[model samples]
Target: GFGCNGPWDEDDMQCHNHCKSIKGYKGGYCAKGGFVCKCY
Candidate 1:
């Protein structure tokens, strides 16, 4: 996991995993405000 960056700010209350390559929800964590699961 250390091979990649993380904690990317998505908007107001969202963050990303900042991986080199992702599949379905690539780039970062797809969560809504307050870390709520939004991406489906």
Candidate 2:
């Protein structure tokens, strides 16, 4: 990745709108990877 960075990789998106607006699981947030269509 040539020493790059993401919009939110260090901190993370936990239990918010971006997280709340998901599917598959019950409730959760994103990971160090990237976005998803799951709640967990």
Candidate 3:
């Protein structure tokens, strides 16, 4: 269950909305490429 609300904002280097699973890599916020997770 990896997902992201939107791209990184121009004023910030983080996403506005994000969500992920905490079940030992169950899911994470995916990046634009949909391959990497914006866990930070």
The deviation in Å at residue 40 for candidate 2 is 4.3
Show the colliding residue pairs in model 1. Answer: 16-29
- Candidate 3: stretches off by over 4 Å: 1-28
**What's the number of clashes in each of the models?**
1, 0, 0
Return the candidate ranking by TM-score, descending.
3, 2, 1
Task: Name the top lDDT candidate.
Answer: 2
List where candidate 2 sits over 4 angstroms from the true fold: 1-25
- Model 1: per-residue Cα lDDT over 1-40, one tens digit each: 2222233533422333433233465444434343432332
Least accurate 10 contiguous residues by lDDT in model 2: 1-10
Task: Estimate every model's Cα lDDT from 0 to 1.
Answer: 0.36, 0.40, 0.37
Q: Output candidate 3 Cα RMSD.
A: 6.6
